[PDB]
């Protein structure tokens, strides 16, 4: 009856870059409120196949 | 395999996407597949031209 | 805007997903995967 799936999220400062191999550090988080409202429009899935 | 390191400022900025339209340059055209079931690699039987 | 700091938090956030829509969504995905 909760009707809400909740995910636990973290904000990180040191991340792997998507544009190439390497790491980068970003400055620490904003002290006020952060709000994001997004539409999940698709999924990226892979398969686990194999002989067994 | 050594490392190249850049140190620079991190100002915070507002960051939110704007839909971007790609457009053909003069001499070119873009064909669009209008099938609602197009699977990504087959033939498309309903094709329109856009810039 | 109600966070603290931890040391020896601020880096803590959550996301809410409609349960009903998510489960319905998977059921439809599954139907297509089942056909395949």
């Amino acid at each position: 009856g909760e009707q809400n799936i909740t995910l636990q999220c973290r904000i990180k400062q040191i991340i792997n870059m998507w544009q190439g191999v390497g790491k980068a550090m970003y400055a620490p988080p904003i002290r006020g409120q952060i709000r994001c409202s997004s539409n999940i429009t698709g999924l990226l899935l892979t398969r686990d196949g194999g002989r067994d | 395999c050594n490392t190249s390191v850049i140190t620079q400022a991190c100002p915070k900025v507002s960051f939110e996407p704007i839909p971007i339209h790609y457009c053909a340059p003069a001499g070119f055209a873009i064909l669009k597949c209008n099938s609602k079931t197009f699977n990504g690699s087959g033939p498309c039987t309903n094709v329109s031209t856009v810039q | 805007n109600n966070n603290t700091r931890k040391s020896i938090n601020i880096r803590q956030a959550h996301c809410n997903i409609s349960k009903a829509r998510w489960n319905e969504t998977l059921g439809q995905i599954v139907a297509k995967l089942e056909e395949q």
Epitope: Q13, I14 | C10 | R5
Partner: antibody, heavy 127, light 110 residues
Framework: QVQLLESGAEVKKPGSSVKVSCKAS????????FTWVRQAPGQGLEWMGR????????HYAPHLQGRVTITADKSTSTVYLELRNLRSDDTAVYFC?????????????????????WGQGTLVTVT | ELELTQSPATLSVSPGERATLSCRAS??????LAWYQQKPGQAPRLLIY???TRATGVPARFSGSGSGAEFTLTISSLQSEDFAVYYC???????????FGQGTRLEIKR
């Protein structure tokens, strides 16, 4: 939660380099950032530089950029300082200091310069 | 690098009195200063984290605040234990080029 243990004292002829080190113990090495301070007699806490242990990078005060290297050995939890082209102006008690970076191992590094953990001081002089 | 100027050293404050210490930056600091206590032969222990947070193990007696380039430190009910030189440090520097001032020593009038 880290204790910093300084190495022994040194006396060097001008033009030589000195290697000074600190052993960090009691917690994960990688979660602490480290700095070096030069307590020259009659002076304040001159900052020499800082090393980041996840991204193995370091930054130095401008007047020492061609003179000081700060490095670390992740397997022995040891912070190292090498200062070259020594002058009598460099007579000082040198030491390590550092801070705890929350879950730095997982990418949550805070990047604090507010030093909490300090060594006892290594005296380096010239002759 | 950014210079930090303090009040004159050797502030004679009798034990039990409230001491006032201060620090002026050549440039603005976004509540990014720190205060440290140095005694001869001792580590320069952190007392205040940022402009106003007490560092671990720091008594209520030792506190302060500030903004911009003007910061103030006070010591309530000054103890014989507090007669040390207090250093001002600035961190709003990237790439790091952190600086310290000279600090002010407290003294007992004789």
């Amino acid at each position: 939660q880290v204790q910093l243990l300084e190495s022994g004292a040194e006396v060097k002829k001008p033009g030589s380099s000195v290697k000074v080190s600190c052993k960090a113990s009691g917690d994960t090495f990688i979660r602490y950032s480290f700095t070096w301070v030069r307590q020259a007699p009659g002076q304040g806490l001159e900052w020499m530089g800082r090393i980041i242990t996840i991204l193995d990078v370091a930054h130095y005060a401008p007047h020492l950029q061609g003179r000081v290297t700060i490095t670390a050995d992740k397997s022995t939890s040891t912070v190292y300082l090498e200062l070259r082209n020594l002058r009598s102006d460099d007579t000082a008690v040198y030491f390590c200091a550092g801070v705890y970076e929350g879950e730095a191992d997982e990418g949550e590094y805070d990047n604090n310069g507010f030093l909490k953990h300090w060594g006892q001081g290594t005296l380096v002089t010239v002759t | 690098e950014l210079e930090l100027t303090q009040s004159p050293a050797t502030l004679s404050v009798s034990p039990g009195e409230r001491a006032t210490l201060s620090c002026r930056a050549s440039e603005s600091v976004s509540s990014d200063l720190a205060w440290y206590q140095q005694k001869p032969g001792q580590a320069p222990r952190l007392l205040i984290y940022g402009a106003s947070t007490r560092a671990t193990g720091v008594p209520a007696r030792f506190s302060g605040s500030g903004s911009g380039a003007e910061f103030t430190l006070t010591i309530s009910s000054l103890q014989s234990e507090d007669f040390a030189v207090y250093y001002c440090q600035q961190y709003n520097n990237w790439p790091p080029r952190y600086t310290f001032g000279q600090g002010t020593r407290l003294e007992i009038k004789r």
